[model samples]
Target chain A: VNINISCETDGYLTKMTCRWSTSTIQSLAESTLQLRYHRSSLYCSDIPSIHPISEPKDCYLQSDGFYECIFQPIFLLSGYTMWIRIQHSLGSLDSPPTCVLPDSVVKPLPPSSVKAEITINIGLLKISWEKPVFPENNLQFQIRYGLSGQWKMYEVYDAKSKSVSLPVPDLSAVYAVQVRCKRLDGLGYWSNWSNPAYT
Target chain B: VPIQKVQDDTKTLIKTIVTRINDISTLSKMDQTLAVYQQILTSMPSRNVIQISNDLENLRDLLHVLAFSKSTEVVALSRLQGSLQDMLWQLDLS
Candidate 1:
């Protein structure tokens, strides 16, 4: 029987999750499926064989035959990471099920929970948040601004310091500052968007 | 609705119910166990506090069974819900 499965990506599991079921079902019986996900930007490889589906028919669709891979978040400025996968044939010589990774911006971790002061200098506006749990490496930031309608974003990397300076545009515009960790792996998740303070 | 959404919402509701049940089982501030009913049972639908008090008092019996029951087969969520429903029924009867 043919089975279809998918999982919502939370950016946590660097590996893909696969669930299996039968198309033309009968009595509760044993079944198996081969799972695989992208390693780098290379060829498809086997992840692991799901064996727990050997039980009688279970209502839990997600757990019927679920498997997770080695979870490792791909950081930035070092190496780009993406997820892709293909299913191995169980019996039939059908075409392999290859899935391209979904393209999405890496959400920055929430900004530091500390408070800070604001200093307006010349035409440039300097916005900074408190650095409580500063990482060992750089603190990568994604600066977002309210544009004509939606949000416009720009990313910058700063040294591991308490405060940093930012250049303001010619027009009197408002901006919100948020910071995230940039691990040696690349860039970690981003912090939440801070209050939009106008200068 | 998406299957994941259904599962997620069901899980969230079940978690809330479990939290409420466990919270009531604390029974730390009970005066003859009826006072416990007056305070924590406020969230529960209007019912006989005396009956609920009696069941809560006997809750230890149910736990004892759960701990010592030598059933090799697994217990399903429906079974747990059924037991809770039975407890509520006993309260109404009392």
Candidate 2:
């Protein structure tokens, strides 16, 4: 029997992959089935080459190779829409492309346990904090405050060594202080700035 | 001149009080609960020692609160946080 098979599979970046298979072929073909996968476009899926995400490393040829294949993306995002289309020249069945929406996107951590203190010695200000307990390396800090009724700020990689006395426009008023952290993975969303102060 | 004498007496009183408190603190550390009672009952002819014993009881009460509190813990954490920044800054400055 000549089999014509095709499917549409695509969703998310770096999320769980999408797969399709035939039960009869799974038991009969047993690992020698080949498939020509395509995208919404007539040409092969242009997913890997065009996007910032990486293409799937390899497709699964289950122990029973019934022409069942999988397509996975590198980044995870359910907000954006994606589509995949496939074709098989000699397969008996034609499967329509699948459409799915992921439940919820994984979120980064929120701002918590933010605190501030002022250390005055030899005419300099030192501000330190409880180092974020989890994956601390993937964070940066931005320090902002008002001096003598003027606003000012600075950014640095380390949170522990946050201290400065370089210069400011105003040194009279109580300066409001804040610190911001961000994820190191690509250019992900940044954490809200933790606000603490100097006197 | 009188202020100097008062300062001297205050220093003596604090030292004497701390000595009594230290004995109980050490006993608690050694887990000698029974021995603590002996120190309480042993009253020599010294009024200062009796006063010191009462001071020790007060300190024991403080210890009861502190034992559950973060007296040692907060110090250790503060020390760790300070040293962490100090070491990093020293490396950068050097």
DockQ of 1: 0.01
Docking class of 2: incorrect
Per-residue lDDT for B1-94 in model 1, tens only? 2334222322322332333343334212122333433345444433232323233433433233223432211122234334444443343231
Instruction: Provide the overall lDDT of each model, using Cα atoms, as 2-decimal numbers.
Output: 0.35, 0.37
Candidate 1 regions exceeding 4 Å error are A1-108, A114-123, A130-138, A146-154, A169-174, A178-184, A187-199, B1-94
CAPRI quality of model 1: incorrect
DockQ of each: 0.01, 0.01
TM-score of each: 0.31, 0.30
Report the CA-based lDDT of candidate 2 relative to the real structure.
0.37
The best candidate in terms of lDDT: 2
Compared with the true structure, what per-residue lDDT tens digits does model 2 show for residues A120-179?
443444544443332223456556666534556676764445344444333444556665
